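Much of the work behind modern protein science is quiet bookkeeping, done one molecule at a time. The fold becomes a row of whole numbers, each drawn from a learned catalogue of backbone shapes. The protein below has been through that process, and both of its lines are reproduced in full.
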Amino acid sequence: GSSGSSGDVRVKFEHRGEKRILQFPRPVKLEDLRSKAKIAFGQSMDLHYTNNELVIPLTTQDDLDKAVELLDRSIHMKSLKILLVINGSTQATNLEPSGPSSG
């Protein structure tokens, strides 16, 4: 079931010339983007998306949420350009919560 009108987020991947397009129905999840890219290629790789001229390594949700929100608003930009870069192995493959708040 799709929560809302049919509106996914086309994410184009890039690895040593190679390319891989994906579809993630908002709200988009950082883990989802990686998971897929990992299944498509079959190797652990980071997700680096370029906004305009610089490169922003999607490490935390904040980055993704900002990349998905800026994409929609952005007219010129068609999709979220991503750049897959080899890494090696995972560190905290075991997802965990967090309570970032002072009092």
Summary: The two ends are 38 Å apart (CA to CA). The chain has two helices and five strands. Strands lie at 8-15, 18-25, 45-49, 56-57, 80-86.
